[PDB]
């Protein structure tokens, strides 16, 4: 490989470097999309977070403000 | 142990009967052989000492010191023959005679079984050193340096003589084994306090203790290279050896008489390390380094624990080797440029690469890089001090940081940067200088490989 100076012009590019760069960008994006398609729980959370206010006093066992 | 003493006494007429052009060769070869013979003293026992006769004995504390002395003689011979080339034959033989007499006195000092004989030899070591300094020094300050070296020592040592003869009249013996077996506690009275001071101050001034060290920069800077080597490597360790010997009869008074000397040692350690940061003379920096390391040794001896004694022994050996190497490294540049100023010759790594490697290794051992025996001793002393009191780590911690700073300051000032343009007489390093540095440095790492040989009798 021989690449000579250009003096105020766009430098000389060989096909292999663009091929490699595009290949690795594509494989990164494919990996991200595939791993999100198969492991969405790792980002969105897996189990529903409950709300304390909607718990009845029967299962929480608090007296009806009398005793 | 006459198998070591007699060969040195034979070195004397061998030097005085040699041809005019073989004195260095003969002295070096037979000094190295004597060192090889003295290597046999390292086979020590676990319970008592080697009691050769009524007069001489070898412990696990004095055997490494004897080996260091006998190994230091040939190195001094190699270091001296460069600047003594224009000297006459008779004066060269007299110089070698002074060195041989110094070795003989040192060898007999470390093995004397009695305290008065030890005193006589430890004081006889003065005459050859004073003659060497005042006769073969370069500048006119050498006379004052000799006076300072003499009187600082004698003013401490004479009360020791009085105390020793008094102790012999009281207990009937000065033999060290009898003294150890028949030890009795010291009461708390003014007479006992002054006896303690008389027994301690001579060794304190030999270390030297901070505030009593002014003689050391003068003597170690104004001396010739062999004088500096033997002053830093062996003669300072006389104080530590004598203090560990004499402290046997000073208990339990030491428990509180050690406080002023401990405070002086720690604070003056900080002070001398700081002094090393602003020093224009390269040799004075190495001298003040010696003062800091010896302050650590004083602390270790004063707190009186097995770990502190082990650390003191290891540190004394390591410092002897390292400081002798540093003095030789500085003397090479001095012989090249005839000046001691540190910022005169710079960028020397460009001109002398192998000497730069030697500088790097010497300054790495000075800052106690693990697992060098320098760090083994320093860490043992630091642990012992921490057990003594948890607040010593702060002072000890500050010292470690400062020592690294000034060591690397010396290295960067001398080796890095750009070479001074006007100096064009920097010749390549001779084989002799490289061999000198190698013979300094290789035993250090070899001893790191087997550290129980320098850890003292408390091991």
């Amino acid at each position: 490989v021989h690449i000579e100076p250009r003096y105020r012009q766009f430098p000389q590019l060989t096909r292999s470097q663009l091929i490699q760069a595009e290949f690795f960008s594509a494989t990164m994006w494919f990996w991200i999309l595939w791993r999100f398609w198969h492991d969405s729980d790792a980002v969105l959370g897996h189990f529903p977070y409950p709300d304390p206010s909607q718990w009845t006093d029967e299962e929480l066992g608090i007296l009806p403000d009398d005793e | 142990m006459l198998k070591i003493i007699i060969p040195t006494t034979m070195l004397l007429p061998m030097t005085w009967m040699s041809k005019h052009n073989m004195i260095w060769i003969n002295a070096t070869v037979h000094s190295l052989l004597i060192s090889l013979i003295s290597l046999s003293l390292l086979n020590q026992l676990g319970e008592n000492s080697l009691n050769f006769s009524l007069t001489f004995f070898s412990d696990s504390l004095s055997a490494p010191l004897l080996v260091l002395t006998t190994w230091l003689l040939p190195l001094m011979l190699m270091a001296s023959q460069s600047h003594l080339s224009k000297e006459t034959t008779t004066r060269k033989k007299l110089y070698i005679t002074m060195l041989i007499l110094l070795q003989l006195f040192l060898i007999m000092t470390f093995t004397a079984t009695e305290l008065i004989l030890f005193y006589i030899l430890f004081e006889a070591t003065l005459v050859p050193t004073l003659i060497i300094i005042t006769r073969w020094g370069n500048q006119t300050e050498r006379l004052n340096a000799g006076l300072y070296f003499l009187f600082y020592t004698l003013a401490g040592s004479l009360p020791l003589l009085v105390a020793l003869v008094y102790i012999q009249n009281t207990t009937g013996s000065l033999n060290f084994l009898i003294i150890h077996y028949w030890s009795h506690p010291l009461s708390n009275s003014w007479s006992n306090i002054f006896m303690w001071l008389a027994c301690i101050m001579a060794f304190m001034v030999k270390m030297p203790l901070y505030g009593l060290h002014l003689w050391l920069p003068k003597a170690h800077v104004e001396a010739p290279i062999a004088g500096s080597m033997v002053l830093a490597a062996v003669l300072l360790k006389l104080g530590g050896y004598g203090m560990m010997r004499i402290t046997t009869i000073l208990n339990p008074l030491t428990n509180y008489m050690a406080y002023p000397f401990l405070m002086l040692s720690m604070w003056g350690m900080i002070m001398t390390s700081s002094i090393c940061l602003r020093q224009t003379d390269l040799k004075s920096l190495i001298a003040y380094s010696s003062v800091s390391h010896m302050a650590l040794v004083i602390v270790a001896i004063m707190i009186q624990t097995p770990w502190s004694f082990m650390g003191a022994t290891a540190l004394m050996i390591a410092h002897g080797l390292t400081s002798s190497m540093l003095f030789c490294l500085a003397n090479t540049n001095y012989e090249r440029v005839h000046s001691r100023t540190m910022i005169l010759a710079r960028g020397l790594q460009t001109l002398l690469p192998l000497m730069a490697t030697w500088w790097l290794v010497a300054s790495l051992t000075n800052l106690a890089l693990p697992p060098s025996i320098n760090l083994i001793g320093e860490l043992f002393i630091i642990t012992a001090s921490f057990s003594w009191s948890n607040i010593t780590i702060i002072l000890m911690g500050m010292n470690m940081m400062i020592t690294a700073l000034y060591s690397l300051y010396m290295l960067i000032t001398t080796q890095r940067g750009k070479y001074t343009h006007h100096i064009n007489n920097i010749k390549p390093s001779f084989t002799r200088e490289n061999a000198l540095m190698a013979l300094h440095i290789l035993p250090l790492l070899l001893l790191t490989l087997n550290p129980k040989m320098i850890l003292g009798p408390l091991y």
Binding site: - | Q349, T350, L351, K418, H421, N424, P428
Partner: protein
């Protein structure tokens, strides 16, 4: 770095230096080229607005004001050329520079390689040895009685003279020595 300095700078010299400094720091602030061109033209117009002031006192007062404004509005991290005294490659190759006198101490086996180079070196050394006294005497003649007043040196004038004090300027190590 090559010219001998003068005892002081002049007012126009100070104005030119401030103009260059301000343009450089403005370029540091204006990263893009078109914006820099716009504000550099504005700066040039501002500089040449007061170009025709015949009162030197007010000229120096304006210069003082401009320097104060520059110090207030300078870029804290201005662009520096890599080999300029604050750049990332300022003294990078100084450790590779070796003075020429070191070659005098090479072992004869080392000098056995490169015979022609050392022959040329001997020719250069003979040239210096022959020209030294003429250089010294020319300096002696051209120097005023009360010692030199600037650091400028005279050139060669005679038949085959050399400009005095030339050896260490001509035999510089290199800018990329190794």
């Amino acid at each position: 770095a090559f010219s001998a300095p003068a005892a002081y700078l002049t007012h126009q010299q100070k104005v030119l230096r401030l103009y260059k400094r301000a343009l450089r720091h403005l370029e540091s602030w204006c990263v893009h080229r078109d914006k820099y061109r716009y504000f550099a033209c504005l700066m040039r117009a501002r500089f040449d607005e007061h170009k025709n002031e015949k009162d030197m006192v007010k000229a120096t007062q304006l210069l003082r004001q401009a320097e104060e404004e520059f110090w207030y509005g300078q870029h804290p991290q201005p662009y520096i050329f890599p080999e300029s005294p604050g750049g990332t490659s300022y003294e990078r190759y100084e450790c590779y520079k070796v003075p020429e006198w070191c070659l005098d101490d090479w072992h004869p086996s080392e000098k056995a390689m490169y015979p022609d180079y050392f022959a040329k070196r001997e020719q250069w050394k003979r040239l210096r040895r022959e020209s030294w006294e003429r250089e010294v005497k020319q300096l002696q003649e051209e120097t005023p009685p009360g010692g030199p007043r600037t650091e400028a040196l005279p050139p060669a004038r005679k038949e085959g003279d050399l400009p005095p004090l030339w050896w260490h300027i001509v035999t510089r190590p290199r800018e990329r020595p190794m």
